[PDB]
Design a protein around this ligand. Structure first.
Ligand SMILES: C[C@H](NC(=O)[C@@H]1CCCCN1)c1ccc(Nc2ncc3cc(-c4ccncc4)ccc3n2)cc1
Length: 245
């Protein structure tokens, strides 16, 4: 009957929205764990035309810093789209940030370079992420970055050139500037602290780097964050430009 229920054993709900869910499953035949995203779809609609288009791009990605795709299929039970991805054992970049990544200088710079390699690859293949945030970046068991989706305010990652009249591959690099700051800064457990500190970074005049973010031990980071967070997209580097720096 259901391909999902026949082939997989549900282990844990990783994510829940009113309009979608991510489940950790184990495939019965190969004994592997996967993350299976389930999304309700309308096949006689433009929403499904758009979803199928995204599934087409995703199925063509092949890089060590991109969450490995396995399958996608539809079940008529109401139509559901299932996307079977790799299961990343060490959860998301949000979890790393909140557990004090900033103190770990060698790891911090390795993870930023891995997000960069993933990003450069996606741009070289003419694609844009459009939702780059730490919850959408996963870490595997060997502590490697895998860029993913985790999609079920958060507009603090959205580039300024996303308005009526003002957006290419440089949208991802603005979001990257917010992420690298969060990665290079101490955890901001409280919402009010997060919305304040990060809105001060998106200021058109200058990205306000907090008082406890000094040019003593954060000079190399401050340069990269200020360059990526530049209001004028053309003034931002490319991912390869930041890699060959
Ligand atoms: C239960 C735990 N939860 C946490 O750690 C929470 C997370 C939120 C913040 C608080 N901490 C948790 C959650 C996920 C994973 N691993 C994992 N791996 C790969 C994934 C791939 C997709 C994907 C990619 C592309 N297209 C579609 C789906 C979605 C989710 C994935 N999740 C491991 C542990």
């Amino acid at each position: 009957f259901s391909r999902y229920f026949i082939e997989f054993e549900e282990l844990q709900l990783l994510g829940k929205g009113a309009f979608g869910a991510v489940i950790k499953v184990q495939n019965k035949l190969d004994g592997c764990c996967y993350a299976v995203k389930r999304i309700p779809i309308n096949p006689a609609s433009r929403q499904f035309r758009r979803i199928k288009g995204e599934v087409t791009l995703l199925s063509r990605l092949h890089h060590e810093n991109i969450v490995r795709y396995y399958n996608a299929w539809i079940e008529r039970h109401v139509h559901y789209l299932y996307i079977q991805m790799e299961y990343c054992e060490k959860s998301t970049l949000r979890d790393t940030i909140d557990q004090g990544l900033y103190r770990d200088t060698v790891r911090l710079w390795r993870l930023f370079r891995e997000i960069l390699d993933g990003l450069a690859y996606i741009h070289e293949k003419g694609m844009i992420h459009r939702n780059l945030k730490p919850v959408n970046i996963f870490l595997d068991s060997d502590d490697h970055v895998k860029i993913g989706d985790f999609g079920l305010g958060t507009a603090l990652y959205v580039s300024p050139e996303v308005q009526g009249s003002t957006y290419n591959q440089k949208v991802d690099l603005f979001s990257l500037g917010i992420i690298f700051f969060e990665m290079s800064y101490h955890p901001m457990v409280t919402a009010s602290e997060r919305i304040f500190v990060l809105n001060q970074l998106r200021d058109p005049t200058s990205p306000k780097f907090p008082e406890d973010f000094d040019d003593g031990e954060h000079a190399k980071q401050k340069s990269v964050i200020s360059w990526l967070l530049n209001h004028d997209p053309a003034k931002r580097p490319t991912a390869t430009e930041l890699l060959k720096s």
